Amino acid sequence: PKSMQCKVILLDGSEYTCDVEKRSRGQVLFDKVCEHLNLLEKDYFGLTYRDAENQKNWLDPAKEIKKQVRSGAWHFSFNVKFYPPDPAQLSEDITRYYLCLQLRDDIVSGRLPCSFVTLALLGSYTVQSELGDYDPDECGSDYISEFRFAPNHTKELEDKVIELHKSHRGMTPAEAEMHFLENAKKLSMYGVDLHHAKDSEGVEIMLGVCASGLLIYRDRLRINRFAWPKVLKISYKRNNFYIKIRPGEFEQFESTIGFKLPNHRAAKRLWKVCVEHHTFFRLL
Ligand SMILES: CCOC(=O)C1CCN(c2cnccn2)CC1
């Protein structure tokens, strides 16, 4: 039985290596990674890989790994796929922990924009969780943390992390992680997956996919929102992505909103993530 070596980048930045039979389905590898991570609430997570166009793709757990990575390396990342709107409802602290690690990368990467004060508050909770109580012996007036907190670090932000860390004395890691999540879950881009697109007049927009529905960003002014219940059918064809939008009470007919994606694979990827979000958040 021939086995392929898999390398998975974990949310702490470490590399997990394992082997699976070369005709394995994605679920096989994902089960090995989740066991390694002692993760039981696996439904919120998945593995990503980079396709021949260098686009992030979700590894479909029901399909052969080889028919997805195709010509590429068996290299993956472990990631949050479905961001829970209320992380307090998760059953296990360790689940909340992995969600914190993902969110920390969302913030540092700039995928999750955040005010100065919220960057410092989230950072202060991370430090409390990881180092415990504020120790002056560690930090002087020139302190810079090893922790990456933000897309652009400033001395002012380091100072504010320390000021807020001082306020958290006696806070346990689970408690600090829950506070982290209570703040992060409120940010306008929390759990929003952004896709570049053009509207039916060729005007560049972003489509965001999240728990509450599909968001259309025309810019920072005029954001259209389609709650999952107002969406009846999602489809792609060639480079085009279509959603059916319900008739408003006493309306005879659904409306169609069409988008142009960069290429056919980008349209299909957007369709699959929308269908998965629609299903997941219909049941939550
Ligand atoms: C370096 C990665 O940066 C991002 O993902 C940001 C995310 C936020 N943002 C938005 C927000 N709404 C509509 C359109 N774009 C700019 C791109």
Swiss-Prot record:
Positions of transmembrane segments: none
Location in the cell: Cytoplasm, Cytoskeleton; Cell junction; Cell membrane; Cytoplasm
Tissues expressing this chain: Expressed at high levels in brain, with lower levels in kidney, intestine, and testis. Detected in lung.
Superkingdom of origin: Eukaryota
Residue span, FERM domain: 4-284
Function: Tumor suppressor that inhibits cell proliferation and promotes apoptosis. Modulates the activity of protein arginine N-methyltransferases, including PRMT3 and PRMT5.
Subunit structure: Interacts (via FERM domain) with CADM1. Interacts (via FERM domain) with PRMT3; the interaction is direct and inhibits the protein-arginine N-methyltransferase activity of PRMT3. Interacts with PRMT5. Interacts with PRMT6.
Designated name of the protein: Band 4.1-like protein 3
Gene name in the database record: EPB41L3
Portion held of the full protein: 107 to 390 of 1087
